[PDB]
Subunit: 279 residues, 5 copies
């Protein structure tokens, strides 16, 4: 039962308390506290021979205080390596973190959030015997709900990885494929493309049909089919229909609700009509 | 029963649950933990194959108002841990469930509670356990905090909100507009507010046997100005039409309003409607 | 009355409201909860149909300065819970109200207080209760915190702010500009700063019987350069006009300023105004 | 003695704790940061126009005061001032709040910078019959780690949206000098295209004769002729003998743009442009 | 023995608590994180140019010190240094603040890394008559969950905003090699369009004769002829017999772009491009 160097102040009535006075006239009191994550245990200060290891006994996280995380500090006069390790059986260990400890340089791990039942520190001394060594361990637990004050907006920044030239990198372009007809054997309107944010459409017409006619249609507000014009990729022909195949037609579809590529007629085989819409 | 820890004494021999600090160890601080960091062991009784442990319903209402719960299970054989809630302490619904592998400490998330009663129920798998522990933590309350403004917070986006390392945005807006619906006689009809659109497609349709639609924009003066549209079927460019069952494309960037005026109509009605796009 | 918990004793037999921790259970920590996690039971007296429970006004002013309040109600029949405030402890205004369903634990939000006094008022519905409890939590203060910078925070947007899994953005900017207003004589007028615009629509209008407007841009040197516009009614392209009651569209990408100079005017006045768009 | 009573544990030991868990067999100490505590500074009713002035409070001490907040309640109107001083003699006002009759009025948290703080309350034109003034102070700063499990929901200022959409600026512009007062033929400086799609180039100076040739570079690094469009008359060309003119170029896909002076006599020539995304 | 007095509960038990609730029938312990506590290091007035140096403070202990903050007040100007050492012998300065005469001056929180910390204060050219130096330390880190109910209001750096709009970059660019020093006919590599709208293709090399044919692929996977526009003269074609030239393509809607060398004699040919969104 040893006495320490700090002394508890006494209140007006001579009662001791682990408090500090405050306010102008020192007539109020407050208890200084620290979350247990700010406390450390010294695990060892025994100097190691060259190559010798210190191994903490496995620490069970399960208890009255449920340990969630661990952090370490090592100081030695010669270089070594600190390992933070975990085990579900307190027998076979995996390394969760490892830090090189330079000679005469205090070295800290990060907070390591634990998942297996048992944790330990293992410190392996390098090729020179230590004359001085200390190893400290902090643990934490729990999680507090907080409400962020709404008075001041939070200032945010983006990763160097999310910017370029001091600007946030965005992607505005959307693309989708669509089947108007697949291996059609007879005349029909086929499926209607929903324009939904696209501005541009490329339509390919292809198949075995020996004769076919495709008519290009859009629908606007009334729901009636309206003829539209496309531009053929190979020769820049502009037309509102085609008798050809093995060809592709580009359309400006901004403002339409739907696009229909109707097979007006077909004989002697089948025809597919498919496209890609881009915003 | 006494424990292995010992409270330090101050200079005057007074015990306290404190630690010393500062260079000369002449200051003191009380180590604390929010109650969310504390756990209760609910059971360590090994279960037979398929046997369940069911905690009695825990009332959230009391001097400490329980807001959330978290569990840890460890067993030498596989099982399933359920966190459950009830408003009547009789019929239970499952709020969360976790598979517990053999010999693997398994934790739930924090579960935020809404009904009056909570419990853990653990169902052992097809092999009898030889070792089992189940721990329960609870929390309560909410503290107001003020975030230090010194350094901006670094943020990142869900894998589901990015693509090529770029944030996915949608810049395009579209709206439909009625200039005229089943108009029977000449008039200007309603004026489209351009409001951030750049492009407009106008359909003219109806039973009218004869009609003339004139295309107008308004800029800063408020006076009508003739504008030209492009007909979709043949790329005719004009500032008016005598036709119907047709659609006209306009570049409307810079205009305040667009008007599609029926100059004349006989022998039926006419609708004029469009879609504006940014 | 003694309670069911028992404080552990340290090695020297000293009791403390602590828990042991570390492998050898030779360290101690005091479990705590912010007062926001504590509740008081206000009443458990069953109410008749339509009967109200009204808490006496609670003064926020005292050694603990109450900033916020939250409530929980449980009853076997439906009712309504009100959180109310008063500056005189006599006339009350409702700050929050929640419907409480039969047999469903119901919580208010945290209500941040402004007047001097707060209270709960609970009004039972049309059926007499056989079971009722009403709990009240209060909080106070605000702690400064520093958020760890190690991991960027994950952010998410409201369902309200996305569409199709993309953030809704607005990339278009528009502004109006006066080159000339009711000009009576020749001058350059005001110079439009291009500042992010790509497109410009300019209207020329007024009483002037004769006028000439010349279209200019300035680039890096600051010398005036002739530019060409496209008239909306007939797609005439020109670098000046003798006309009015007309509008001219310009591509202004790359220019620093745009000037619409009145070269000459007789017999009235002339306005020249436009809208610039990105 | 107050109205609260500490509970006793199983062994009859008192503690400032509450029981919890189903069997009430665990204990927890209720706490509050000192920022949630208040001191009543005064309840003495003031005459019309009379002021209450708190003595200067030194922030420096065992508890290092970082911030202060006030609450005032009076049956007549007045004004509460929060003030600071480095010498406890000359005072500057950091905050001021009007206090209406019969309305509890709070300041914000005021973060302090000078050594001493005080409240000063000035009563209005009517004598008070009832008055209380409360003061809370805070201190310190705790390091926290925000849970990474759940994204935070964020929203934008009314000032940063329009029509429910975030306001963005996608356009970038930069100016560039190809040549400045060139006296003799050379390639001049090469514009790095870097995200621009469009370029406007002005050619101007005293040279009596000059020829500028328009070049782009792509992947190979060899110069390739490009065409521009003159602003005044929409001439399209890959070079010019003229000056006091500007040429517009589509530069999407190029790495660099060069405006080479092929020849010049009888003066100097500048060639400068603006590139836009 | 201080001026504050612990209240007594109903049973006359003292406690470091405050009462609360309307009837003052509940109790709470006022607390402060240790970061809110300060130690006075010195109040000894320094002569002109004289320094105060705190003895090195070991961070390692039962409380693991993570950070430190200082406040200085003097009637004459000086400089406060926060310093660190791994050996308690050689010191490096981590932070430094000028302290004006008669102005309370604070450092920021300094997060420590070496084993030992200290304050060193150097007085300026005039002897002090009044001086105090205070030191706060902190430790630990608490896991917190930010309430999901209310969106946070967020703001962007002055550096990321312009005209009240967030600065974004929507344009993406990539280079692509169709052929490099090809010696014989082949299709070469196929460009994946992947979000690009525009493509500039350069054809160059030693080949004395070559033919390149321009192809796109859409949904069927069959090659489709596409037309490009040559930069030097705005020729539009779906193939070329030339080289030392560049061709611009609109590729929106295609899945892949292929630049096929149909034939080549008398040297090699490279075909490379830049695709832009």
């Amino acid at each position: 039962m040893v006495k320490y160097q700090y002394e508890f102040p006494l209140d007006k009535a001579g009662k001791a308390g682990a408090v500090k006075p405050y306010r102008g006239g020192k007539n109020d009191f407050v208890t200084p506290v620290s979350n247990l994550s700010g406390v450390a245990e010294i695990l060892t200060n025994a100097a190691l021979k060259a190559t010798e290891a210190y191994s903490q006994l496995g620490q069970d996280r399960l208890g009255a205080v449920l340990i969630s995380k661990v952090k370490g500090w090592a100081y030695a006069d010669r270089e070594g390596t600190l390992f933070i390790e975990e085990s579900d059986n307190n027998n076979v260990w995996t390394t969760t973190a490892a830090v090189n400890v330079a000679a005469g340089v205090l070295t800290a791990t990060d907070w390591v959030y634990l998942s297996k039942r048992y944790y330990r520190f293992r410190y392996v001394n390098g090729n020179l015997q230590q004359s001085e060594f200390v190893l400290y361990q902090s643990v934490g637990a729990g999680e507090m709900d907080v409400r962020v004050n709404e008075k001041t907006p939070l200032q945010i920044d983006f990763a160097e990885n999310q910017t370029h030239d001091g600007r946030l990198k965005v992607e505005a372009r959307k693309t989708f494929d669509f089947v108007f007809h697949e291996n059609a054997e007879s005349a029909s309107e086929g499926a209607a493309l929903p324009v939904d944010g696209a501005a541009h459409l490329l339509v390919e017409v292809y198949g075995t049909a020996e004769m076919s006619e495709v008519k290009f249609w859009g629908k606007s507000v009334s729901g009636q089919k309206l003829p539209i014009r496309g531009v053929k990729t190979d020769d820049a022909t502009t037309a509102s229909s085609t008798l050809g195949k093995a060809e592709a037609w580009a359309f400006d579809i901004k403002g339409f609700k739907e696009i229909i590529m109707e097979i007006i007629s077909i004989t002697g085989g089948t025809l597919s009509v498919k496209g890609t819409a881009v915003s």
